[PDB]
Amino acid sequence: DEDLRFCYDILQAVSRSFAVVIMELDEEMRDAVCIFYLVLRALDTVEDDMSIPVEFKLRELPKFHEHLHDTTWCMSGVGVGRERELLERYTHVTRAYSRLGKAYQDVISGICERMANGMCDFLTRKVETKADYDLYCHYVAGLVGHGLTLLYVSSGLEDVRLADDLTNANHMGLFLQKTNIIRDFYEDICEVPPRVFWPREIWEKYTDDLHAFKDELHEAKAVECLNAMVADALVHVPHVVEYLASLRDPSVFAFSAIPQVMAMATLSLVFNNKDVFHTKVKTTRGATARIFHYSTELQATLQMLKTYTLRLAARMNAQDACYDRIEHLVNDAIRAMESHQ
Amino acid sequence: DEDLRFCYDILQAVSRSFAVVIMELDEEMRDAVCIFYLVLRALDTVEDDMSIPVEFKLRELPKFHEHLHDTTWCMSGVGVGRERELLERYTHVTRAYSRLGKAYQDVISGICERMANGMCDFLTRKVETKADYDLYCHYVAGLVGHGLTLLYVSSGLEDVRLADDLTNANHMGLFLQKTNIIRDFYEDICEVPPRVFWPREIWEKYTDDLHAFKDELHEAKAVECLNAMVADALVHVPHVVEYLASLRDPSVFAFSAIPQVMAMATLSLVFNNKDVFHTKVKTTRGATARIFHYSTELQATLQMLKTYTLRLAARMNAQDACYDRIEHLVNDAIRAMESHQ
Amino acid sequence: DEDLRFCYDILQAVSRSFAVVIMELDEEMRDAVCIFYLVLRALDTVEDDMSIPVEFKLRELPKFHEHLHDTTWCMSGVGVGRERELLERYTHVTRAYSRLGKAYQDVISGICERMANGMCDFLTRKVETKADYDLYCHYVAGLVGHGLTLLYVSSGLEDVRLADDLTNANHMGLFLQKTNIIRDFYEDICEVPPRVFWPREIWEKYTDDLHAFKDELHEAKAVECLNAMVADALVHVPHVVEYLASLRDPSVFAFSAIPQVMAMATLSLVFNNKDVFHTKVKTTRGATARIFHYSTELQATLQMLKTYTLRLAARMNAQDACYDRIEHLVNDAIRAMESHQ
Amino acid sequence: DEDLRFCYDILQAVSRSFAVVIMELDEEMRDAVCIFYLVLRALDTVEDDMSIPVEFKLRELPKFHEHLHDTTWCMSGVGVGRERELLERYTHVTRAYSRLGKAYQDVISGICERMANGMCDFLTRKVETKADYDLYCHYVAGLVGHGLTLLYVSSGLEDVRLADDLTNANHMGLFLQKTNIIRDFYEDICEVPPRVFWPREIWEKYTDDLHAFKDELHEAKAVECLNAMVADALVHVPHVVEYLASLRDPSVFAFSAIPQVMAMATLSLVFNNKDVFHTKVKTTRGATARIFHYSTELQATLQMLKTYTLRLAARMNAQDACYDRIEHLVNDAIRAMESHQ
Ligand SMILES: CCCCCCCCCCCCCCC[n+]1ccn(CC(P(=O)([O-])O)P(=O)(O)O)c1
Ligand SMILES: CCCCCCCCCCCCCCC[n+]1ccn(CC(P(=O)([O-])O)P(=O)(O)O)c1
Ligand SMILES: CCCCCCCCCCCCCCC[n+]1ccn(CC(P(=O)([O-])O)P(=O)(O)O)c1
Ligand SMILES: CCCCCCCCCCCCCCC[n+]1ccn(CC(P(=O)([O-])O)P(=O)(O)O)c1
């Protein structure tokens, strides 16, 4: 009663975005996801902290999922802001966890450990190749796509067949992560220490050092690299459409579609936009408001995704580098969409 | 793409108000409105410059909208400060104008012309009758209402029904225009030569000379004439509510609502306020800040309009001459608001 | 109407600080706050006037909020200047107080009485312990915080919630009053009779007599006692952050944030500074101008509070006898801020 | 601590003017500017000392900046008054200089070296042409503009964009310097050996021997050349305005605007004034007092610059030779001013 209430309060504080979308789910399905999120967040808080030894994480992280049964466990000196409160009072999270369905628990605990190890794998190294990039996204976001899908099936709102092949589920998360990584470029590289996610296998093709983009001097090259990043992101769209088209429950659907449409809308604004290198490109509050309202049923979301992918490809020129490549991806995305119309 | 960055830069440095509100619109719709404003603003510059021969205006103004098809046209020695830069570098406006859909282009070019000739009709005659006052407001503001309405329809964000009867779209324009005309009495009449908009058919019932109000001697007759103006403005409120109540899109709503609420707020401060004759009555940045924040949905903005219409009525008592005339318009206004709550 | 036009004029004269921040508020809101301030300022005139017999206060202060219902009452034999004119013409204050909403009048009448008896307590005893210190501030500053919060709720601009735990509303007043005292050390002790607020429990750990700080010889022990007081105030920073983050209405926030940011800025200047013992340390009019400008929304005021708290913790070295105590209270607040970022 | 205190004291003793204005800045910036000024002032002292041989200056000046990293360096037999003390106890400056942000150090050290060599150049040749006149001013003033501007950017107070085209910054300096040169004519030529700065290119049209102007006989032609100088200075005003309108930070604005308004006020008083050839023309202490008070925000200062330029253009008749050209520069100046009003 009290415990679960803390989760939403801490959730509402930690992630103001997700906290909203999650309200689309029904109480039960909602409580599980809330916990599921927090657990992943608490785990994230331990990694993002750069005031704790590297061999310390490689020690506790892989063992983190075991605390989900230790209602007395908690951490105190890690995290920034509300995140700290989440770990120091992690008790509430584990308290609510114990009361969830055994099935839900196994999924949360399962993904937690799987994601944890992935972080350790990328702690002692960086993202150099595309394969590195795609894998990293799988660990931090992709796995959330699996965890969620599995949670949808365990609830019964979706058919079990939905968990047969989690390739699309992975794409879902990878689309949100890659879109954000692109959008939040400047925001990340300005932090201390500078955060980088863009794969060297891609940005090397346009510069020697990534910090070079923060210069209006190397603007031209900067934009090219950007479009290349977006191009890589659009590869997931067709699969995103497929996944959404396989959902049958209203609650589950809306909750899964909104974040996607959101991403597609953001991806259409950052595309070939030099502003991405000096500010945080965002959509109007009225834009998201429209999305949150019309993304309750497939057909509707499809026309919005359609329009945003059109506005994206409509922001380039024939004699522009990434032209030929982008158009192929646009047609692909639209084909997958019209394929469900 | 560089061209477009000029429109917004010049926009921001020419209209502190519009510059912020316009951001409530999505880039697609935003680019159109941005251009639409500048074109109209460039037109205003020419018409206002009193050093330019009357006949040159009457001759060139009716064909101003034609230079939108000329991507090399511009003006050199006209306007002061930034409005001049707008003309000299008018290139970008016409450049960005071309990169717009036919639908939008025809709307802008269409209204520009209609407004242009409207200004001409008043370059050779003063505003004497109330009809003139309204006709004038139609040309300078009302039409701006038609233009936006059409643009809304043309974008698909609003139902094509919205453009069947542009009557209320005109009331939207007059409310803002008339309010400003009232609020900016002193400033306008102080310019050289003094600019007057208050219809003789109204103030003549309170004074021989309109400048007489600049003197605290005729403060009594001044306020009375002021309340006469405010009344003539409260005739559009009901229609303003009707128009905002027909908008379904968030962006198009917020963008249309905010200015209206801002108007009712200012009108509630100038009403029966002697200070209107020796200073510019404004609303605290906090008040106007609260207006931008809440004016996103029909209900919220409706209770704000009501709040300000009441605060305005409470600033008068039985003995006041206008009392009856005002209470009537106030109720007529509130009844409309309630009709949608 | 002419009474209220007197308050502001005397408000501008009495306080040149509050008189500015109070303009951020809306009309209805602003009027009550002005009366609320004056009624209390007038109370401060009697409580401070030393040439007045100590009993002449103990017998009349408890019965001061009573005169709030006598539109003819007043007092002449007290005051030094503007404060003297206020009481003598107090009529206007109670005059306008009569036209305030029933809800408002009580919040004022309540705190006034609650503050009168509080000042009567210290007119028979001195400030010895920290408890006595925090208690005094509460009476003259914290109570003002209570009243203000009560006014926000009474106005409906804020949630009725805000009135449940007036602990932070108290911390607000304390932080300000404490900063003023820490900064106004010299100005106060340089009077007849000399005014001291610094609690013995704190300065007696560095010197036998407080007037010793007026000497260049006891500078080292003057700074330590200084940094000790600054540490005592930093205890309220975290709480202040909470009260500001609990606000929602633009106007109420600014009017409440600007003063807090000011205090913090001042505190980062008087901290670890010897000049505090022979002059009034102030912030450049440009610095305070920047503050008034950016303290409109939470996030903005936060990064500023942060900046100034970093500027304070930067003016101390490891060899300082308080580094640790302060470097602990610094993150206490910094994290409270990051807790809302 | 002990060193910084010296700088501010040696500063207030060497420059009563600059010492007052610098107080508009925030300590961090203020210290950097304080040190920067001194270094350049110590650099000036060595050059202006006429008792020292030429080869000495041409040897030490070029390496002067190097002494910035030698906390044990100093100079003895050079200069008189407090200036001499600045060199002898130069140790203090280097002490504080080292305790400055490495970003500021490079700017001060950078500008110092450049200005130094420049001074060495004009130590072996007279001011002959306008190209020279402008270059000399660039060395001993323009560079001060670059440095000051560079410091603004390196402080975060101003946008990094402000340091892209330091052409206006240079204009800022030249206007000031040229204004002083014009005003201090009599003083510069009454020393031994007579110091002359007015480029031959300009005073050749009025006489063969510049000293002729000290003689009342040539008053008629002296004043005529005087206006030729004022005309050359005004060429910068438009640029000055541009730079000022480019500032966003309050503290940085006042510090940069005040000196400019001071010059324009002095220029309008020296213009077409014969007294320049026998005494020092100054503004009333009240006038300068008024300037400090209002020169806080663009609008106030802009309309203040206006008032003075008009006061200037109003000190000439209709038959004055300079007439025509003057008004052009004036109107062209007021233009840029209204370009923001
Ligand atoms: C079935 C669809 C699959 C989509 C799953 C969504 C994956 C989103 C990636 C979230 C990765 C979880 C680790 C938490 C790290 N974290 C900290 C802050 N945020 C960003 C948050 P934001 O600042 O956007 O409010 P949010 O995106 O979680 O709402 C993420
Ligand atoms: C359905 C919505 C209809 C609302 C239409 C708005 C009509 C407002 C009339 C504005 C007339 C445009 C012609 C330009 C003339 N002009 C010069 C200065 N201004 C005032 C400008 P301001 O100083 O307030 O920033 P703004 O009112 O354009 O924002 C206007
Ligand atoms: C919700 C936030 C709560 C903040 C409450 C602010 C309390 C400020 C303490 C003021 C005490 C009121 C009794 C009048 C005593 N008094 C005499 C002079 N002053 C200082 C005035 P100042 O010289 O700075 O213009 P001010 O700080 O009231 O503006 C105060
Ligand atoms: C973007 C801001 C650019 C403004 C730059 C200011 C340029 C001012 C020229 C000062 C040249 C610095 C070298 C010191 C030589 N010096 C000796 C005496 N003075 C006059 C001094 P004063 O007698 O007026 O107190 P001050 O003008 O330094 O205040 C200057």
Side-chain angles (χ1 to χ4, degrees):
Chain A
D1 186 60
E2 182 206 324
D3 303 297
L4 193 63
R5 208 170 297 286
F6 172 72
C7 298
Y8 286 115
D9 179 62
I10 195 67
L11 168 63
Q12 162 213 61
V14 152
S15 186
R16 194 148 291 153
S17 297
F18 190 71
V20 180
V21 186
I22 197 172
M23 293 305 283
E24 295 291 305
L25 304 172
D26 300 58
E27 175 174 14
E28 185 178 303
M29 182 78 277
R30 190 152 88 255
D31 301 307
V33 177
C34 185
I35 306 300
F36 175 55
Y37 179 75
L38 297 177
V39 178
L40 298 181
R41 185 60 182 242
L43 181 62
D44 176 64
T45 299
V46 182
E47 173 197 60
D48 208 7
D49 187 302
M50 302 313 291
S51 63
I52 29 182
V54 182
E55 62 290 318
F56 163 56
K57 305 175 183 177
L58 310 173
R59 178 190 302 130
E60 280 277 49
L61 293 185
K63 187 186 69 182
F64 193 84
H65 76 297
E66 298 174 1
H67 307 306
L68 294 177
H69 290 294
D70 187 341
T71 58
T72 67
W73 188 84
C74 72
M75 213 145 99
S76 301
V78 176
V80 298
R82 221 71 178 188
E83 296 175 355
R84 300 170 56 64
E85 199 181 309
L86 176 58
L87 288 169
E88 309 188 308
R89 307 176 64 184
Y90 197 68
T91 306
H92 301 72
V93 181
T94 54
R95 295 284 197 59
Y97 177 87
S98 64
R99 283 172 285 250
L100 294 179
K102 202 280 290 185
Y104 293 128
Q105 304 182 304
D106 295 315
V107 179
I108 301 177
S109 181
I111 297 297
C112 179
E113 172 173 47
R114 298 179 61 181
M115 178 182 272
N117 290 176
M119 306 179 104
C120 301
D121 180 3
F122 272 99
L123 255 179
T124 58
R125 66 197 190 80
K126 328 294 291 185
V127 178
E128 310 303 303
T129 70
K130 283 189 174 183
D132 293 352
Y133 185 42
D134 282 59
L135 183 60
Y136 176 65
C137 297
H138 169 67
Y139 289 135
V140 300
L143 288 176
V144 180
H146 295 192
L148 288 176
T149 296
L150 300 178
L151 288 175
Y152 300 153
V153 179
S154 180
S155 65
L157 303 180
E158 293 300 304
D159 187 62
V160 63
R161 219 77 301 173
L162 186 64
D164 296 332
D165 191 303
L166 302 180
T167 296
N168 290 318
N170 182 63
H171 282 295
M172 289 292 270
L174 258 60
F175 187 60
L176 295 180
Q177 198 59 56
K178 292 187 177 182
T179 299
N180 288 305
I181 289 181
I182 297 177
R183 191 282 289 293
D184 300 305
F185 177 62
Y186 187 67
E187 195 182 310
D188 293 302
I189 195 174
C190 295
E191 255 140 294
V192 186
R195 285 176 170 56
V196 178
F197 290 117
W198 296 32
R200 186 192 299 289
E201 188 191 310
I202 298 181
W203 61 260
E204 87 184 308
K205 290 251 194 62
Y206 308 107
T207 183
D208 61 320
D209 178 54
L210 198 62
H211 296 60
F213 294 143
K214 297 188 298 180
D215 188 4
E216 187 184 305
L217 169 61
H218 309 298
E219 187 185 70
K221 281 278 77 71
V223 182
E224 287 194 1
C225 181
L226 173 56
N227 305 309
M229 284 295 281
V230 179
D232 174 62
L234 290 172
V235 181
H236 304 289
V237 182
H239 298 295
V240 174
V241 176
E242 290 297 303
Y243 181 106
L244 289 177
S246 61
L247 296 175
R248 75 185 191 190
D249 183 292
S251 299
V252 176
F253 176 99
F255 166 86
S256 301
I258 299 179
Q260 298 307 308
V261 183
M262 285 295 293
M264 184 50 81
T266 305
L267 187 64
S268 64
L269 265 50
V270 299
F271 173 62
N272 183 31
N273 189 319
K274 64 188 194 59
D275 293 299
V276 179
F277 294 108
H278 71 61
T279 185
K280 181 179 180 180
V281 180
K282 200 182 305 175
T283 67
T284 64
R285 56 179 175 178
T288 76
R290 186 192 306 130
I291 301 178
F292 272 68
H293 170 62
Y294 290 111
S295 296
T296 50
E297 62 83 3
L298 192 58
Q299 300 312 308
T301 89
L302 283 182
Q303 10 192 61
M304 293 189 272
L305 287 177
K306 174 89 64 54
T307 303
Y308 281 120
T309 59
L310 291 172
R311 272 289 301 178
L312 183 165
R315 286 179 48 60
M316 68 194 313
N317 309 302
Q319 16 70 301
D320 258 299
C322 65
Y323 195 75
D324 295 298
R325 176 65 187 301
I326 291 299
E327 189 172 7
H328 171 57
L329 297 171
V330 179
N331 285 56
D332 246 299
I334 296 181
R335 273 186 170 179
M337 291 178 245
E338 305 184 306
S339 179
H340 284 289
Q341 298 186 302
Chain B
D1 194 63
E2 181 195 301
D3 300 301
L4 206 52
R5 249 100 181 297
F6 178 64
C7 303
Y8 289 115
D9 273 56
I10 205 73
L11 172 67
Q12 156 233 61
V14 176
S15 181
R16 188 107 295 174
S17 304
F18 207 73
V20 184
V21 178
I22 191 176
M23 290 312 296
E24 289 295 305
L25 301 174
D26 299 51
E27 284 196 356
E28 160 110 307
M29 183 87 278
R30 199 160 67 209
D31 289 303
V33 179
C34 180
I35 302 298
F36 184 44
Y37 175 73
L38 299 176
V39 177
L40 296 176
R41 185 46 179 280
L43 179 63
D44 179 64
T45 302
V46 183
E47 181 272 68
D48 216 15
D49 193 311
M50 299 305 266
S51 71
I52 299 178
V54 188
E55 46 292 316
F56 175 75
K57 297 180 182 179
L58 297 134
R59 183 223 303 161
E60 293 292 341
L61 291 182
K63 41 152 54 184
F64 185 74
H65 63 295
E66 272 177 66
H67 312 289
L68 296 174
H69 300 308
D70 188 308
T71 54
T72 65
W73 184 86
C74 64
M75 209 130 104
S76 299
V78 181
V80 296
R82 198 114 311 227
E83 304 175 359
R84 180 171 177 170
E85 185 190 304
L86 172 60
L87 293 176
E88 308 187 309
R89 310 178 61 180
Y90 201 64
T91 300
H92 305 76
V93 180
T94 54
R95 289 295 211 64
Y97 177 76
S98 65
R99 289 200 284 275
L100 289 179
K102 265 275 295 180
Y104 295 133
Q105 303 187 305
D106 301 305
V107 178
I108 300 177
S109 180
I111 295 297
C112 174
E113 175 177 53
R114 297 180 61 182
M115 184 182 291
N117 294 87
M119 308 176 153
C120 293
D121 184 9
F122 278 102
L123 272 178
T124 58
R125 74 193 193 74
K126 312 310 302 177
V127 178
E128 302 298 304
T129 64
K130 280 190 172 184
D132 289 351
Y133 183 49
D134 282 50
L135 180 60
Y136 174 64
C137 291
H138 167 63
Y139 290 133
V140 303
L143 287 175
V144 182
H146 292 193
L148 292 176
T149 299
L150 293 178
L151 295 183
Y152 297 143
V153 179
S154 183
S155 71
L157 294 179
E158 288 303 304
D159 194 55
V160 63
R161 211 99 300 168
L162 192 67
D164 295 313
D165 187 323
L166 297 175
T167 293
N168 295 309
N170 192 64
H171 288 293
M172 285 288 279
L174 274 60
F175 192 58
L176 304 182
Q177 190 53 53
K178 291 186 176 183
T179 297
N180 292 304
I181 290 182
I182 296 178
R183 191 283 299 293
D184 302 307
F185 177 71
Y186 191 53
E187 176 178 297
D188 289 311
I189 199 172
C190 286
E191 293 179 357
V192 194
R195 281 189 169 64
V196 173
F197 295 115
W198 290 32
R200 175 187 285 283
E201 192 185 308
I202 295 185
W203 60 263
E204 110 184 307
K205 303 164 178 164
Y206 296 97
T207 180
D208 328 298
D209 189 308
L210 186 54
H211 283 61
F213 295 144
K214 298 195 300 180
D215 185 0
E216 171 170 42
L217 172 59
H218 309 298
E219 193 180 68
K221 289 284 76 146
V223 179
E224 293 194 4
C225 183
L226 173 60
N227 302 351
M229 293 298 279
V230 177
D232 176 63
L234 288 177
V235 180
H236 312 300
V237 178
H239 301 299
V240 172
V241 181
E242 297 305 309
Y243 186 104
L244 296 180
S246 66
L247 300 179
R248 72 190 187 191
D249 180 293
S251 299
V252 176
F253 177 95
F255 169 80
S256 303
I258 298 176
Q260 299 306 305
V261 180
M262 291 280 272
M264 182 51 79
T266 298
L267 190 65
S268 70
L269 264 51
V270 300
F271 175 66
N272 202 56
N273 189 307
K274 66 186 190 63
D275 288 34
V276 177
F277 295 105
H278 66 62
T279 185
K280 178 181 177 182
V281 181
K282 305 177 183 180
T283 64
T284 62
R285 54 176 176 172
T288 161
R290 187 194 308 96
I291 302 176
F292 280 61
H293 176 69
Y294 289 111
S295 297
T296 54
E297 64 96 5
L298 186 61
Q299 287 301 302
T301 87
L302 278 178
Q303 56 192 62
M304 287 191 269
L305 291 175
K306 182 126 67 65
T307 299
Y308 284 117
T309 60
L310 292 176
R311 293 186 55 61
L312 181 163
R315 294 187 55 167
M316 77 191 313
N317 57 197
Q319 70 92 295
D320 281 300
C322 53
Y323 192 75
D324 305 305
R325 181 69 175 301
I326 293 299
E327 185 191 6
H328 172 51
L329 290 173
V330 176
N331 278 61
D332 221 306
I334 290 200
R335 278 178 169 172
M337 293 174 251
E338 300 178 300
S339 175
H340 296 281
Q341 295 182 299
Chain C
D1 185 71
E2 193 178 306
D3 305 300
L4 205 65
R5 193 173 298 291
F6 162 66
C7 296
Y8 291 110
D9 282 58
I10 199 65
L11 175 57
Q12 173 195 59
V14 172
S15 180
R16 182 156 294 79
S17 299
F18 196 77
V20 182
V21 182
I22 190 176
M23 296 312 289
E24 293 297 304
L25 301 175
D26 294 51
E27 263 286 50
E28 190 180 306
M29 180 76 264
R30 185 165 53 194
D31 292 306
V33 182
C34 181
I35 312 303
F36 177 55
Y37 178 69
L38 296 176
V39 178
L40 296 178
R41 181 59 184 250
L43 178 64
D44 185 62
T45 303
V46 183
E47 174 264 59
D48 173 290
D49 194 304
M50 301 311 289
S51 61
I52 293 181
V54 187
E55 93 288 56
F56 190 59
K57 307 175 183 178
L58 295 172
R59 188 209 313 85
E60 313 222 65
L61 292 182
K63 43 105 72 174
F64 181 56
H65 66 299
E66 303 174 0
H67 307 302
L68 290 172
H69 284 298
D70 186 47
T71 55
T72 67
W73 191 79
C74 62
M75 215 181 136
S76 304
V78 180
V80 295
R82 316 311 310 185
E83 300 172 355
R84 185 207 177 195
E85 186 191 306
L86 178 59
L87 296 170
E88 301 178 302
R89 311 180 63 188
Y90 198 65
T91 300
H92 307 65
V93 184
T94 56
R95 281 287 189 60
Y97 170 66
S98 297
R99 285 175 288 296
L100 294 177
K102 231 290 291 185
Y104 287 128
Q105 298 187 61
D106 294 301
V107 176
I108 297 178
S109 178
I111 297 299
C112 180
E113 170 185 55
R114 296 186 55 186
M115 186 181 279
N117 293 150
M119 311 181 114
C120 300
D121 182 6
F122 281 102
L123 295 179
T124 61
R125 63 196 194 71
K126 312 265 289 186
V127 184
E128 311 300 301
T129 64
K130 286 186 174 182
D132 292 356
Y133 185 49
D134 291 57
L135 178 56
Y136 174 58
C137 298
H138 166 65
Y139 285 130
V140 301
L143 291 177
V144 180
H146 286 184
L148 294 181
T149 304
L150 294 176
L151 292 176
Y152 306 145
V153 179
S154 179
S155 67
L157 287 175
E158 290 303 304
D159 200 69
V160 58
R161 208 78 301 168
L162 207 62
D164 293 319
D165 205 32
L166 299 177
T167 297
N168 298 306
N170 182 61
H171 282 291
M172 287 288 272
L174 259 59
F175 185 62
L176 289 178
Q177 194 62 63
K178 287 192 176 183
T179 297
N180 280 40
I181 296 179
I182 296 180
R183 188 283 299 296
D184 300 311
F185 177 75
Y186 199 64
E187 188 181 305
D188 293 305
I189 192 173
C190 293
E191 287 170 349
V192 179
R195 289 175 174 56
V196 173
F197 293 113
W198 295 41
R200 179 197 297 289
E201 187 183 305
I202 301 179
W203 65 262
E204 79 181 308
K205 303 195 189 74
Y206 303 103
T207 182
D208 293 302
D209 188 58
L210 200 63
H211 297 60
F213 294 142
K214 245 187 298 180
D215 189 4
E216 183 199 306
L217 183 59
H218 297 292
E219 196 172 68
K221 275 294 160 56
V223 179
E224 293 198 3
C225 178
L226 172 71
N227 301 15
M229 297 298 270
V230 179
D232 173 62
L234 294 173
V235 184
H236 305 300
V237 184
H239 303 286
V240 175
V241 180
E242 289 298 303
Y243 185 100
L244 293 180
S246 63
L247 297 174
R248 63 186 185 186
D249 175 277
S251 297
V252 178
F253 175 98
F255 164 95
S256 303
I258 296 180
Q260 305 309 304
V261 183
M262 284 288 273
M264 181 57 82
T266 299
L267 193 63
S268 65
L269 244 48
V270 303
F271 171 68
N272 199 63
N273 173 47
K274 56 169 182 191
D275 293 298
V276 180
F277 298 112
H278 74 62
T279 184
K280 178 183 179 181
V281 177
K282 301 180 179 181
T283 58
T284 60
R285 54 179 176 177
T288 153
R290 192 190 308 88
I291 293 181
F292 268 77
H293 180 72
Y294 291 117
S295 294
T296 59
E297 56 96 2
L298 188 57
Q299 298 310 301
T301 72
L302 287 178
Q303 77 181 71
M304 288 206 277
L305 290 175
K306 166 81 73 60
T307 303
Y308 280 126
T309 56
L310 297 175
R311 300 293 294 176
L312 183 165
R315 286 153 56 66
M316 78 190 316
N317 304 299
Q319 59 88 296
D320 285 299
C322 64
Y323 185 101
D324 294 300
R325 199 303 157 83
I326 294 295
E327 221 250 62
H328 149 59
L329 288 169
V330 153
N331 287 63
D332 223 306
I334 289 182
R335 257 173 293 167
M337 289 168 232
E338 304 183 306
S339 179
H340 296 297
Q341 301 184 305
Chain D
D1 184 62
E2 180 184 300
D3 296 296
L4 215 66
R5 189 166 304 298
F6 172 74
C7 298
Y8 281 109
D9 281 319
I10 191 68
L11 172 65
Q12 190 261 50
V14 184
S15 180
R16 173 184 287 78
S17 303
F18 192 70
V20 181
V21 178
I22 191 176
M23 299 309 286
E24 297 297 308
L25 305 175
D26 307 301
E27 300 207 79
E28 180 182 300
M29 183 76 273
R30 196 151 64 189
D31 299 319
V33 181
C34 182
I35 305 299
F36 179 49
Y37 176 79
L38 292 175
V39 178
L40 299 179
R41 195 50 186 283
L43 189 62
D44 187 63
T45 300
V46 180
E47 174 212 60
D48 228 298
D49 189 308
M50 298 307 280
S51 66
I52 316 175
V54 180
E55 78 259 58
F56 179 73
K57 302 176 182 177
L58 300 175
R59 177 223 308 159
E60 295 289 59
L61 288 177
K63 69 173 68 177
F64 199 75
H65 64 299
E66 304 174 2
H67 310 307
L68 290 173
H69 299 297
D70 193 305
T71 62
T72 65
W73 193 79
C74 68
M75 223 160 127
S76 300
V78 177
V80 299
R82 233 60 184 179
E83 287 181 350
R84 186 182 186 182
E85 183 182 303
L86 179 60
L87 294 174
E88 305 185 306
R89 300 174 62 182
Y90 197 65
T91 300
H92 293 78
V93 181
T94 54
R95 300 299 190 64
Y97 176 68
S98 61
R99 288 191 283 283
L100 282 173
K102 203 268 288 187
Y104 296 138
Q105 310 183 308
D106 295 55
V107 180
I108 302 176
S109 178
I111 295 297
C112 177
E113 191 185 308
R114 301 173 61 176
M115 186 182 283
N117 296 94
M119 303 180 97
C120 299
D121 178 6
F122 284 109
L123 270 175
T124 53
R125 64 200 195 72
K126 307 295 296 180
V127 186
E128 295 305 323
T129 62
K130 281 188 175 181
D132 286 352
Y133 184 55
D134 280 54
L135 182 59
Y136 174 61
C137 295
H138 166 64
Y139 287 133
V140 302
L143 291 175
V144 184
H146 297 207
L148 291 177
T149 304
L150 297 174
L151 291 180
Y152 300 139
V153 176
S154 181
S155 67
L157 294 175
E158 292 305 306
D159 184 51
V160 63
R161 199 117 305 173
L162 182 63
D164 294 306
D165 185 57
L166 299 172
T167 305
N168 272 301
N170 187 67
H171 281 295
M172 285 285 269
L174 279 60
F175 181 59
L176 291 179
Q177 196 53 51
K178 290 188 176 182
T179 298
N180 282 302
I181 297 180
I182 298 175
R183 190 278 288 295
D184 297 303
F185 177 69
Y186 188 64
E187 190 179 306
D188 296 307
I189 205 172
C190 289
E191 287 183 353
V192 186
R195 291 176 171 59
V196 177
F197 296 117
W198 293 13
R200 175 181 295 297
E201 196 180 310
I202 298 180
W203 64 274
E204 52 177 47
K205 295 185 179 66
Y206 310 100
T207 186
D208 304 303
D209 174 55
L210 193 64
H211 286 64
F213 299 152
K214 293 198 303 175
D215 188 3
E216 191 178 305
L217 167 63
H218 287 281
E219 159 177 354
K221 257 295 166 56
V223 178
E224 206 165 302
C225 184
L226 173 58
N227 301 304
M229 289 299 284
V230 181
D232 178 59
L234 291 173
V235 181
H236 303 292
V237 180
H239 291 287
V240 166
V241 181
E242 296 306 308
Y243 186 110
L244 297 177
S246 176
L247 300 174
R248 74 186 191 189
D249 181 291
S251 299
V252 172
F253 179 97
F255 169 79
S256 301
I258 293 183
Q260 294 308 324
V261 182
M262 280 300 294
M264 179 53 85
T266 297
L267 184 58
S268 65
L269 231 58
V270 299
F271 175 68
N272 198 60
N273 188 312
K274 65 149 192 184
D275 303 309
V276 177
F277 297 107
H278 83 68
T279 186
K280 186 175 182 180
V281 181
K282 299 183 177 183
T283 66
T284 66
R285 52 175 174 174
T288 153
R290 186 190 306 114
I291 299 179
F292 276 71
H293 188 64
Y294 292 103
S295 298
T296 56
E297 55 87 3
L298 189 56
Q299 293 307 303
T301 138
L302 281 181
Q303 80 173 67
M304 183 137 59
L305 284 171
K306 179 96 70 62
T307 300
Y308 278 118
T309 69
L310 293 183
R311 271 299 309 180
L312 182 167
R315 279 174 54 64
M316 51 153 58
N317 267 302
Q319 52 62 51
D320 292 297
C322 61
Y323 188 80
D324 273 289
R325 183 57 195 295
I326 290 298
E327 251 190 355
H328 173 52
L329 294 174
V330 173
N331 286 60
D332 194 46
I334 295 179
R335 269 181 165 181
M337 284 179 235
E338 312 190 307
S339 179
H340 296 292
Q341 291 189 299

